[PDB]
Amino acid sequence: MRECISIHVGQAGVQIGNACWELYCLEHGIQPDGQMPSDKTIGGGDDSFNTFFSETGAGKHVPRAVFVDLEPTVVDEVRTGTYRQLFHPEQLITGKEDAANNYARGHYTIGKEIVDLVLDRIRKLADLCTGLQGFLIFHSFGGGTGSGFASLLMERLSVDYGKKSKLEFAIYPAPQVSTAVVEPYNSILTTHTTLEHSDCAFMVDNEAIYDICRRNLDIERPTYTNLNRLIGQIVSSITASLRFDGALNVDLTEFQTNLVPYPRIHFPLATYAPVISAEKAYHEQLSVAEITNACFEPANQMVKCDPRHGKYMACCMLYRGDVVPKDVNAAIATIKTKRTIQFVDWCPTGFKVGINYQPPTVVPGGDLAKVQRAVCMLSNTTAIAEAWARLDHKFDLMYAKRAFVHWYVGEGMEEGEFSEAREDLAALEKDYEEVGV
Amino acid sequence: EEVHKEFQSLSVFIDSVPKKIRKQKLEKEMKQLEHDISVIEKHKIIYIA
Amino acid sequence: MREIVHLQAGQCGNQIGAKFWEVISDEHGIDPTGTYHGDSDLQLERINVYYNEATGGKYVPRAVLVDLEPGTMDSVRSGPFGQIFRPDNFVFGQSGAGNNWAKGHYTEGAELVDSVLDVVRKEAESCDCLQGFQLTHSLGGGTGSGMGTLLISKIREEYPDRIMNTFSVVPSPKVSDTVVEPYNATLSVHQLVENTDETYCIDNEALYDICFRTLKLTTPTYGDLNHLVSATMSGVTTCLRFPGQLNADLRKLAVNMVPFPRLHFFMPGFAPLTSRGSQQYRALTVPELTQQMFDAKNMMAACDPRHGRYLTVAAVFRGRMSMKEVDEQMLNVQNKNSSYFVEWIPNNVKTAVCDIPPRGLKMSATFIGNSTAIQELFKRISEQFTAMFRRKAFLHWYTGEGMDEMEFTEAESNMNDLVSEYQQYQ
Amino acid sequence: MREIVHLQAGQCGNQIGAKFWEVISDEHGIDPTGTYHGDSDLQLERINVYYNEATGGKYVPRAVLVDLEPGTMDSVRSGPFGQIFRPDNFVFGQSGAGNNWAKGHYTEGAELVDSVLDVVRKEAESCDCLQGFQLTHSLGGGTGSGMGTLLISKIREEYPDRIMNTFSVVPSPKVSDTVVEPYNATLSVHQLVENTDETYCIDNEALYDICFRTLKLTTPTYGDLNHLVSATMSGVTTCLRFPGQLNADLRKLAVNMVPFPRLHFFMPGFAPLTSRGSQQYRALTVPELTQQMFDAKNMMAACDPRHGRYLTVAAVFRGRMSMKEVDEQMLNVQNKNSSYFVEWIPNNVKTAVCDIPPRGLKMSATFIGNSTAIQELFKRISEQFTAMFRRKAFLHWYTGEGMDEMEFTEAESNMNDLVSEYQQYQDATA
Amino acid sequence: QITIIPHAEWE
Amino acid sequence: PISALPAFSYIPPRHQGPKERSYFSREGQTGIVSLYDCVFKRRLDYNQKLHRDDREHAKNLGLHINEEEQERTVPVLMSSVYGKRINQPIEPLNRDYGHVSHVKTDFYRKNEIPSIKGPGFGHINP
Ligand SMILES: Nc1nc2c(ncn2[C@@H]2O[C@H](COP(=O)(O)OP(=O)(O)OP(=O)(O)O)[C@@H](O)[C@H]2O)c(=O)[nH]1
Ligand SMILES: Nc1nc2c(ncn2[C@@H]2O[C@H](COP(=O)(O)OP(=O)(O)O)[C@@H](O)[C@H]2O)c(=O)[nH]1
Ligand SMILES: Nc1nc2c(ncn2[C@@H]2O[C@H](COP(=O)(O)OP(=O)(O)O)[C@@H](O)[C@H]2O)c(=O)[nH]1
Ligand SMILES: [Mg+2]
């Protein structure tokens, strides 16, 4: 029975877990204590809250997540937060010292101390689950822990569970704004493991949610919590088919099959619609055609790239709320009758439509006004590789003069892994070019 | 406190003889006051003559 | 769990360290008695980075105070917050160095170093996981520029992995109070470059310059100079003690500011330094601080960054804001003053935000930058030192300690090599 | 049930015994009159190990105070706890020995040993089940170094099975107040090694160093030294006196402490010694207690243990506490200082626990060590003795008392053989 | 279970 | 001295005035009124939860930071920001669309072997 396990690693992973688990608990009715006000007894939906929560002997519901950080305070704030008794104590795992923005430190020196502890914890959650669907793993490329420890942990999980699918959600370094100067090295070195040990990954850059939140939602002063809320809503849109019934329910394996044409091409881009504030939502009627047209606007992409500069390979629509398949068909005909939207010649039919019933909810302290229908789009296209190209340019300008190499070398890795990963990314960009041909 | 703060204000290296005597004067008071507070905490009832 | 040991050498560093221990006591809520009278319990969560615990809720500092003269010891012993320190940590000699580096480093050095290792050890095993060492001294004294270079030499052999940071005070040629100052400094800079992860250069003349013009105070004493240094040290570690949106530590920056192991001299800055009458015509906003540390007049040392290229830049913000505009102001200043940044490193600026603001002002930021302007500071010392050494003036004092003349040439050669490779990186 | 008989010899032994009886009377809540005014029931449960019952609810110390000079008895009787001792327990001659071991041991000792044996036999047949004898003297005296060893010989003949321990004050080479001190030392050490189950060596120079630096007292009188020795002597037997989590006694420590009968010399130590300045800045914990008892400066003897190898170590803890910090801390202090412990004995550390804290404090610890460094002081006594003896100096005072010339030779041979086997046990392969 | 102090001591 | 008196240093002991004169609220005492009681009247017991008696509140013992954030009108801790106003009322939860396991709740039972014997009291009257 459908169950998914969270492996949130890094400060980004922990904060995303904060947002997401708040969203799940208010989606299902969980109080912060761990007792819903009405479980089973009066009606009661057993299948509703066992994709994420598990029942205990005292009738409390435990999240199916693992919070891992090599620094204490980011998880200590959760241990002292309002969900202290909601979370499991041994689930929250901390370290005394961190990688300090070093992939090498997070991969070879400090990760091996607690890798056994996190893998035994994950084995316990896998014991708890009966039919496991996949692991949602949240991290960033820039942070040393969130790169090195994430890479080592998922390369352990690959041999631990050969078939059990892994969904990698990660923060992509932004083209212009940056919070570190050693992040290109860590991203380049992470990309090898993210290529060889992933089935589907959702690298996102902060600048896109910044500009979208400013333009559509009218908040002049955005913070990280709004981005985390949007990411959590995207994940809830993904998992709505597992949580709640629909006319065309879509399992994770369904879009895994219908999003990946070739094994090396598993880097889709996700988008959500609609994102409007209440004051403007007063005036504008919302329908399927308008929201699905909002999906295809390049200004609403969560990754800084123009799909008009590339070609769509596959597209997965996840409609949610009060939507009707006739309107989906009308919208898809309207979309297909556009010259600006391009598709590869080996995909005349490039759409995976799924439909749910329950509308998305709104989170207290949130930003989005309530909208009775919503949609998520997962587009596999070739316009993403230019971000890898500019990251390669930044890495090359770093690596010509051997800057910051001494930190990694004194840690103790071998230097040609840098050039090896550069070659691998050049090959990946070449493969994307071949598909673009 | 003022005796001990004076004891605390005291020089760490004490080479001179008039230093060496003024250390003791506080300790004579220090032992006395500690003795008095010790015995009054022994019981709450004070039957005295 | 994450601890810092705060060494204390020389008359300058002792008064600077005394001021620092007062300031952070006024951030965590410690009376001169030593009890926690704090209001927020957030003030008492991470106090064990700087303080050790004692019976009855007593907090003792993790500071080892050393000086070759017991007289300056009594001064801090008579200070306002002089009562918190442990007298066992008070280790001192009997005869001073007379501002002679070789006397400190060699002659009067061997006897008292052994005592200070034991306490430095004793604090080290007290903490379960020690992040690294903190030491304050002046590069113009006999102990701190002397002994102090000897202490860091031994502890790097004994704790190699641990980070050592030094708030070393750098002499100015414009206002000089020592004439053998080039001799002791040139024999000190060689010690820092071979063993130091990060160094901060601080000049008293620019600290006077800020008080004269940025603050316009009528009589800046040495107490005002020390607090301005002290607030920077609290601005370094504010993200370690208190949580913030983008947490960081001393190692988060340490890897981020060092492109090559030779370059570890930085430009500390404090953002909210405004004159007294300016507060009336003011409206506290984030870009105001952004304009405030990116002028060279706010710099606390004696070199203009407009004469060099900024290699790496950090601005650690302390207080509650949001990150969107501070990235814009990061991006705005990077595109505007592109010439003064290096081309081979895009995104030269690393930012961190801690939520807890300082007492007395909502908004505070600490700027730590590595620029090519620091090469104008070593060159000016060699201009003086070679004038001394060409005539062999003031040599019999150092030669009286038994050391050779070869040490002078290598120290100049190392600093000449340092500024040569520092010039090729421009 | 398990009684201790306190033998008290010489001026030094008399003073330290007076201090020790004062301290244990403080612990058991006994006034200078003789009545019990303590509060807790456990303060009077095993009082009969040092105290004999007397009518009117009185308790008399179970000690025998012997001296050839009547002068020190007047001071003892004039002390604060002076009238607590039974007058019949005082055995004094009319003239002393004048620091002459031969006069103490042979000529003038013979008349008074009969009286001492009479009172000791009465005292021994008082108690039903006697654990043994605990003696206090100095090897540099005339009586304690002299007739005290003769009493040890007679008692070891009389009661072979009972445990006897000597808290012996050993002279220092640096600070010396007698010239025939090496003569008395070499003529005594032979007796102690021939019949002694355990010796605790205390040195006044080391005690003075403790007074100088650890406690920082400006005018350290001999009362300070006697108080410290009293604290050590109490801490030895606190476990026997009071219940604990892991009880022990004199035989518990001695059987565990003596691998071979020739090695019974031990250095003592007391943990909670801090200056009044140091009391303010301290976190009183078992970690700091272990650090303080394992630093070699706190040692009560005149030998640095870092030049030898610790054969065996025992720690008796006083006060309420949890064993795990002790077991892990003895384990890690075994682990770091691996060079200073012998390899042919695993788990060189033996621990005992008593719940009742000392009065006026919450935690305390007493350390008893057998280490290789103690042979240094013996070899220095030999270096002094041979240098004085080679010129045949100061021997007429002894030779007028009727002994031969070969007793010095055999005592020197005995102590040379002892330090030889001590060094060969130092140099041993597993 | 009562403290007793002399008058001179109390003064 | 008066000249050695500083030029701008005005820092008292870290105590604030009224709640208006604070970044925070809820002013209270130190909790200790005599440092003689502080230094001397230490505790004979050892608490087993803490490994060091000096580290009295190392595991958040008797500290109510969450309670103080809910008391104060604004979340100072920025992670306390993300969940504060859940107590305010939100759109009633929609429940009718969620899976329920009819197969397990009907097909699968525990015991009671009904087919063999039917002598029960008050049954099979539909
Ligand atoms: N979207 C989002 N990104 C975050 C968040 N927190 C951190 N990040 C990103 O993560 C990157 C650094 O990684 P962190 O998660 O902060 O730290 P880490 O993963 O523990 O790795 P280290 O920095 O070495 O300790 C930064 O560049 C941020 O862009 C968050 O809450 N939301
Ligand atoms: N910033 C600052 N510098 C100081 C202070 N006190 C002394 N100094 C500097 O310290 C230098 C003298 O140091 P010195 O006492 O010889 O150091 P020592 O030999 O190591 O003890 C002088 O050049 C002063 O400029 C102070 O309070 N603040
Ligand atoms: N530690 C200590 N040693 C003492 C004390 N009184 C005397 N001594 C030592 O005893 C030695 C003299 O012993 P002595 O009186 O000749 O012993 P006696 O001949 O048996 O009476 C001196 O060397 C002193 O150091 C004391 O109170 N404490
Ligand atoms: Mg991190």
How do beta strands C3-9 and C63-67 pair?
A: parallel
Distance set, CA E8 to CA A161, B37, D235, D266, E11 (Å): 87, 17, 38, 50, 5
Resolution (A): 3.5
Tell me which residue of A43, A40, A39, A65 sits closest to A52, measured CA to CA: A65
Option in F42, F44, F52 nearest D320 (CB): F44
Annotated binding site of A: 11, 71, 140, 144-145, 179, 206, 228
Tell me which residue of C82, C14, C77 sits closest to B11, measured CA to CA: C77
CB of C331 within 8 A of CB of C229? no
Quote the ligand 3 centre to D177 CA distance (angstroms). 9
CA atoms within 13 A on the CB side of C285: 9
Tell me which residue of D163, D165, D135 sits closest to D147, measured CA to CA: D135
Residues with CB under 6 A from ligand 1: A 10-12, 15, 69, 71, 98-101, 140, 142-146, 171, 179-180, 206, 224, 227-228
Tell me which residue of D8, D300, D301, D302 sits closest to D141, measured CA to CA: D8
Please identify, by atom number, the ligand 2 atom nearest to the C-alpha of residue C9: 20
DSSP C357: P
Which tokens hold the place of C401?
A: 């300690």
Which residue type, as a one-letter code, is found at position A431? Answer: D
Dist CA B19 CA A336 (whole Å): 98
Q: What is the DSSP string of F80-112?
A: HHHSSGGGS--SPPP-SSS---HIIIII-----
Q: Would you call C372 exposed, middle or buried from its count of C-beta atoms within 10 A (0-12, 13-18, 19+)? A: buried
Tell me which residue of C194, C98, C101, C249 sits closest to C417, measured CA to CA: C194
Q: In sequence order, what are the beta bridge partners of D92?
A: D67
How do beta strands A373-381 and A269-273 pair?
A: antiparallel
Dist CA D122 CA C193 (whole Å): 81
Phi (first) and psi of residue A200, to 5 degrees: -165, 130
Q: Would you call B38 exposed, middle or buried from its count of C-beta atoms within 10 A (0-12, 13-18, 19+)? A: exposed
DSSP C238: H
Quote the ligand 3 centre to D171 CA distance (angstroms). 9
Dist CA A103 CA A101 (whole Å): 7
Instruction: Say if the Cβ atoms of B30 and D280 lie within 8 Å.
Output: no
Specify the residue with its C-alpha closest to ligand 2, atom 17.
C141
Option in A223, A401, A404 nearest C322 (CB): A223
CB of D164 within 8 A of CB of D35? no
DSSP D49: G
DSSP C261: T
Dist CA D35 CA D29 (whole Å): 9
Residue with tokens 């051997």: A402
- Positive or negative, the CA dihedral A294, A295, A298, A302 is positive
Distance set, CA F19 to CA A41, D15, F9, F29 (Å): 48, 65, 23, 14
Which residue type, as a one-letter code, is found at position A302? Answer: M
Which tokens hold the place of C370?
A: 């590595």
Instruction: Say if the Cβ atoms of B37 and F35 lie within 8 Å.
Output: no
CB of A111 within 8 A of CB of A413? no
Size of interface C-F (CB pairs under 8 A): 113
CB of A361 within 8 A of CB of A320? no
Instruction: Say if the Cβ atoms of B5 and C83 lie within 8 Å.
Output: yes
Which of A55, A155, A254, A417 is labelled catalytic? Answer: A254
Type and span of the H or E element at C354 = strand C349-354
Which tokens hold the place of D159?
A: 């009661």
Dist CA B5 CA F32 (whole Å): 18
Q: What is the DSSP string of D142-160?
A: SSTTTHHHHHHHHHHHH-S
Which tokens hold the place of A425?
A: 């990314």
CB of D139 within 8 A of CB of D185? yes
Option in D277, D278, D283 nearest C55 (CB): D283
Could you list the beta-strand ranges (E) of D236-383.
265-270, 310-318, 349-354, 364-371
Burial C279-306 (b: 16+ CB within 10 A, else e): eeeeeeebeebbebbbebebbbbbbebe
Residue C310's SS3 state is strand
The whole-angstrom distance between C77's CA and the closest CA on chain F is: 17
User: Contacts of residue C261 in chain A, CB cutoff 8 Å?
Assistant: 406
Instruction: Say if the Cβ atoms of C37 and F76 lie within 8 Å.
Output: no
Specify the residue with its C-alpha closest to ligand 1, atom 8.
A12
User: Contacts of residue D276 in chain B, CB cutoff 8 Å?
Assistant: 7, 27, 30
Tell me which residue of D272, D274, D300 sits closest to D286, measured CA to CA: D272
Quote the ligand 2 centre to D339 CA distance (angstroms). 45
Helices A288-295 and A325-336, axial angle in degrees (round to 10): 40
Instruction: Say if the Cβ atoms of A98 and C251 lie within 8 Å.
Output: yes
Dist CA A181 CA A179 (whole Å): 7
Q: What residues contact D384, with CB distance under 8 A and at least 6 apart?
A: D173, D182
Instruction: Say if the Cβ atoms of A96 and C1 lie within 8 Å.
Output: yes
Dist CA C38 CA C25 (whole Å): 10
Q: C35, C53, C55: which to substitute to probe chain D, counting the most D Cβ within 10 Å?
A: C55
Residue C259's SS3 state is coil
Dist CA C385 CA C370 (whole Å): 25
Which tokens hold the place of D54?
A: 């007397």
Quote the ligand 4 centre to C252 CA distance (angstroms). 9
The whole-angstrom distance between B17's CA and the closest CA on chain C is: 18
Residue C229's SS3 state is helix
Q: How many CB atoms lie within 10 A of CB C218?
A: 7
Domains along chain C? Answer: 3-257 (3.40.50.1440), 265-374 (3.30.1330.20), 375-425 (1.10.287.600)
| Contacting subunits of E (3+ beta carbon pairs below 8 A) | B
Dist CA A66 CA C148 (whole Å): 46
CA atoms within 13 A on the CB side of A412: 6
Q: What residues contact E8, with CB distance under 8 A and at least 6 apart?
A: none
Quote the ligand 2 centre to C11 CA distance (angstroms). 5
Q: Would you call C174 exposed, middle or buried from its count of C-beta atoms within 10 A (0-12, 13-18, 19+)? A: exposed
**Best residue among A7, A9, A11 to mutate for probing ligand 1, ranked by most atoms within 8 Å of CB:** A11
Helices D181-194 and D374-389, axial angle in degrees (round to 10): 130
Instruction: Say if the Cβ atoms of C77 and B13 lie within 8 Å.
Output: no
First-residue to last-residue Cα distance in chain D? 42
Active site annotation includes A254: yes
Distance set, CA D369 to CA C295, D134, D307 (Å): 68, 18, 14
Tell me which residue of C395, C393, C370, C411 sits closest to C149, measured CA to CA: C411
**Best residue among C143, C152, C169, C172 to mutate for probing ligand 2, ranked by most atoms within 8 Å of CB:** C169
Residue D375's SS3 state is helix
Dist CA D117 CA C20 (whole Å): 72
- Whether chains D and F touch (3+ CB pairs under 8 A) is answered by yes
| Contacting subunits of D (3+ beta carbon pairs below 8 A) | B, C, F
Q: Is D8 annotated as a binding residue?
A: no
Type and span of the H or E element at A224 = helix A224-243
D222 CB near ligand 3 (under 6 Å): yes
For the stretch F72-76, contacts whose Cβ atoms lie closer than 8 Å and that sit 24 or more positions apart, written own/partner, are: F72/F24, F72/F25, F72/F26, F76/C42, F76/C320, F76/C355, F76/C356, F76/F23, F76/F24
Dist CA C269 CA C301 (whole Å): 9
DSSP C48: G
Tell me which residue of A144, A134, A196, A349 sits closest to A258, measured CA to CA: A349
D136 CB near ligand 3 (under 6 Å): no
CB of D325 within 8 A of CB of D251? no
Instruction: Say if the Cβ atoms of D277 and C87 lie within 8 Å.
Output: yes
C109 CB near ligand 2 (under 6 Å): no
Method: cryo-EM
Cα C292 to chain centroid distance, Å, stands at 21
Please identify, by atom number, the ligand 3 atom nearest to the C-alpha of residue D98: 19
Helices C181-194 and C148-158, axial angle in degrees (round to 10): 10
User: Contacts of residue D277 in chain B, CB cutoff 8 Å?
Assistant: 7
Dist CA D419 CA D413 (whole Å): 10
The whole-angstrom distance between F84's CA and the closest CA on chain C is: 17
Quote the ligand 2 centre to C107 CA distance (angstroms). 21
Residue F6's SS3 state is coil
Type and span of the H or E element at C390 = helix C375-390
DSSP C36: B
